[PDB]
Design an enzyme around this catalytic site. Structure first.
Site, PDB file in Angstrom:
ATOM      1  N   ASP A 117     -10.502 -24.586 -27.358  1.00 19.53           N
ATOM      2  CA  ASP A 117     -11.533 -25.415 -26.719  1.00 19.53           C
ATOM      3  C   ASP A 117     -11.432 -25.418 -25.177  1.00 19.53           C
ATOM      4  O   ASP A 117     -10.557 -26.114 -24.613  1.00 19.53           O
ATOM      5  CB  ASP A 117     -11.309 -26.855 -27.232  1.00 19.53           C
ATOM      6  CG  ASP A 117     -12.333 -27.850 -26.766  1.00 19.53           C
ATOM      7  OD1 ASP A 117     -13.399 -27.469 -26.218  1.00 19.53           O
ATOM      8  OD2 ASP A 117     -12.115 -29.067 -27.000  1.00 19.53           O
TER       9      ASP A 117
ATOM     10  N   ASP B 115     -18.081 -24.035 -22.478  1.00 17.21           N
ATOM     11  CA  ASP B 115     -17.324 -24.848 -23.536  1.00 17.21           C
ATOM     12  C   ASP B 115     -17.196 -24.212 -24.953  1.00 17.21           C
ATOM     13  O   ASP B 115     -18.147 -24.284 -25.753  1.00 17.21           O
ATOM     14  CB  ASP B 115     -17.933 -26.245 -23.664  1.00 17.21           C
ATOM     15  CG  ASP B 115     -17.137 -27.152 -24.549  1.00 17.21           C
ATOM     16  OD1 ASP B 115     -16.053 -26.691 -25.080  1.00 17.21           O
ATOM     17  OD2 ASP B 115     -17.596 -28.339 -24.702  1.00 17.21           O
TER      18      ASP B 115
HETATM   19  C1  1H8 Z   1     -12.544 -32.411 -27.890  1.00 17.67           C
HETATM   20  C2  1H8 Z   1     -13.942 -31.945 -28.246  1.00 17.67           C
HETATM   21  C3  1H8 Z   1     -14.094 -31.655 -29.766  1.00 17.67           C
HETATM   22  C4  1H8 Z   1     -14.592 -30.451 -30.207  1.00 17.67           C
HETATM   23  C5  1H8 Z   1     -14.738 -30.113 -31.572  1.00 17.67           C
HETATM   24  N1  1H8 Z   1     -15.363 -28.868 -31.820  1.00 17.67           N
HETATM   25  C6  1H8 Z   1     -15.868 -28.363 -32.985  1.00 17.67           C
HETATM   26  O1  1H8 Z   1     -15.799 -28.939 -34.047  1.00 17.67           O
HETATM   27  C7  1H8 Z   1     -16.558 -27.063 -32.949  1.00 17.67           C
HETATM   28  C8  1H8 Z   1     -17.444 -26.739 -33.982  1.00 17.67           C
HETATM   29  C9  1H8 Z   1     -18.113 -25.532 -33.899  1.00 17.67           C
HETATM   30  C10 1H8 Z   1     -17.898 -24.727 -32.735  1.00 17.67           C
HETATM   31  C11 1H8 Z   1     -18.575 -23.457 -32.600  1.00 17.67           C
HETATM   32  N2  1H8 Z   1     -19.115 -22.454 -32.512  1.00 17.67           N
HETATM   33  C12 1H8 Z   1     -17.006 -25.117 -31.724  1.00 17.67           C
HETATM   34  N3  1H8 Z   1     -16.415 -26.295 -31.891  1.00 17.67           N
HETATM   35  C13 1H8 Z   1     -14.403 -31.045 -32.571  1.00 17.67           C
HETATM   36  C14 1H8 Z   1     -13.944 -32.294 -32.162  1.00 17.67           C
HETATM   37  C15 1H8 Z   1     -13.744 -32.584 -30.781  1.00 17.67           C
HETATM   38  F1  1H8 Z   1     -13.247 -33.799 -30.430  1.00 17.67           F
HETATM   39  C16 1H8 Z   1     -14.944 -33.038 -27.772  1.00 17.67           C
HETATM   40  C17 1H8 Z   1     -16.347 -32.499 -27.961  1.00 17.67           C
HETATM   41  O2  1H8 Z   1     -16.385 -31.385 -27.028  1.00 17.67           O
HETATM   42  C18 1H8 Z   1     -15.356 -30.506 -26.940  1.00 17.67           C
HETATM   43  N4  1H8 Z   1     -15.563 -29.334 -26.279  1.00 17.67           N
HETATM   44  N5  1H8 Z   1     -14.189 -30.715 -27.485  1.00 17.67           N
END
Ligand code: 1H8
Ligand code: NA
Ligand code: NA
Length: 376
Positions: free
Chosen positions: A37, A222
């Site tokens: 991430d 991101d």
């Molecule tokens: C930490 C934080 C986060 C991120 C995720 N990502 C996914 O589930 C996820 C799902 C599908 C894709 C694709 N292709 C990328 N990421 C889950 C919880 C979560 F807390 C907050 C929100 O934004 C960011 N970037 N990260």
């Protein structure tokens, strides 16, 4: 430098669930799958038997775990996690051949955080200290890696969209992963990987918005967000151009708000009726930009849990600024060149395309007043 065969193909995932890398934590090592991430800065891992988790970090098994005796509580828009901070030895099996003592947040309670059915159980926050929780004195993983080893201060990502996989090259760039040339945009501030978008075209027609709108209140790259997210006003103008350019068919308008799926008979989605979308990014040189171009293949995402061929519109409105999520990244090989504070883009050697169009990275263009496009 330029060739890292042991790291090629080290990422996996499933559609809609993100891209993860295998990591080991502790002594003896515990293997965990960890979501990559670029939009966050904490290394946080499930550390309790949450029913959705295949595996979790068991601190009691690690002779090298050290407790920091400090808790962390982290709410997001959708759900939260809380846990306990410590450090331990971490390694990346398909990564550089080194071990690092890193901060780890052992997640002991969460809500709407882990995905039921996914194969990852933690998150590797690859952005900067300024957005680490609980504050910026908690050093992020990649900072520890660089401080403690001779790994160069850069990494790169190639995300291959639809099962999915890709590569994360830690310490370098692998030239077999892209075609043509890398074009670089400055990182505007080290917190998120914040960049400046200077112009937006839909099938080569300019949106003609004040460019400050494109970055209201920031634009970021991101890997932990699926969609292209656009500030609301920009979303409204972009959709209205996409519908026009496409009004050769008429869909339910709930489709454009991501509220309903659209389906065709397996075999021929009509990609050709949908326009390409181009983002011009600030270049390295005064008055110079370059442009990256994505296809409908990137912004119309296959949805598999239902008989024919169903898609979700994967561009969505935002209140947190522009987010170039896996919708943008899957077209490109992206270099996070932290040593020179810049992000490189090139056409990915794996991006999904047809016989008529591909993704593109082109320059230089002359764009004036690019510094007015940043929001304070
Ligand atoms: C930490 C934080 C986060 C991120 C995720 N990502 C996914 O589930 C996820 C799902 C599908 C894709 C694709 N292709 C990328 N990421 C889950 C919880 C979560 F807390 C907050 C929100 O934004 C960011 N970037 N990260
Ligand atoms: Na170093
Ligand atoms: Na190449």
């Amino acid at each position: 430098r330029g060739s890292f065969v042991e790291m090629v193909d080290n990422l996996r995932g499933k559609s809609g669930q993100g891209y993860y890398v295998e990591m080991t934590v502790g002594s003896p090592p515990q293997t965990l799958n960890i979501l990559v991430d670029t939009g966050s800065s904490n290394f946080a891992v499930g550390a309790a038997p949450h029913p959705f988790l295949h595996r979790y970090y068991q601190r009691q098994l690690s002779s090298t775990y050290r407790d920091l005796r400090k808790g962390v509580y982290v709410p997001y828009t959708q759900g939260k996690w809380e846990g306990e901070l410590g450090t331990d030895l971490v390694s990346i099996p398909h990564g550089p051949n080194v071990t690092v003592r890193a901060n780890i947040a052992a997640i002991t309670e969460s809500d709407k955080f882990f995905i039921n059915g996914s194969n990852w159980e933690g998150i590797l926050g690859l952005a900067y200290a300024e957005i680490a929780r609980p504050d910026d004195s908690l050093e992020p993983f990649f900072d520890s890696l660089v401080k403690q080893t001779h790994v160069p201060n850069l990494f790169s990502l190639q995300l291959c969209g639809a099962s999915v996989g890709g590569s994360m090259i830690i310490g370098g760039i692998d030239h077999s992963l892209y075609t043509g040339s890398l074009w670089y945009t400055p990182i505007r501030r080290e917190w998120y990987y914040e960049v400046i978008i200077v112009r937006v075209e839909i099938n080569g027609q300019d949106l003609k918005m004040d460019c400050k709108e494109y970055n209201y209140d920031k634009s970021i790259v991101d890997s932990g967000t699926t969609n292209l997210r656009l500030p609301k006003k920009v979303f409204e103008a972009a959709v209205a151009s996409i519908k026009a350019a496409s009004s050769t068919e008429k869909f339910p308008d709930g489709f454009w708000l991501g509220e309903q799926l659209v389906c065709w008979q397996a075999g021929t989605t009509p990609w050709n009726i949908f326009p390409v979308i181009s983002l011009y990014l600030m270049g390295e040189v005064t008055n110079q930009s370059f442009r990256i171009t994505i296809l409908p293949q990137q912004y119309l995402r296959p949805v598999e849990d239902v008989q024919d061929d169903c898609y979700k519109f994967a561009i969505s409105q935002s209140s947190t600024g522009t987010v170039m999520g896996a919708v943008i990244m899957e077209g490109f090989y992206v270099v996070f060149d932290r040593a020179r504070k810049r992000i490189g883009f090139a056409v990915s050697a794996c991006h999904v395309h047809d016989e008529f169009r591909t993704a593109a990275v082109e320059g230089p263009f002359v764009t004036l007043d690019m510094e007015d496009c940043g929001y304070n």
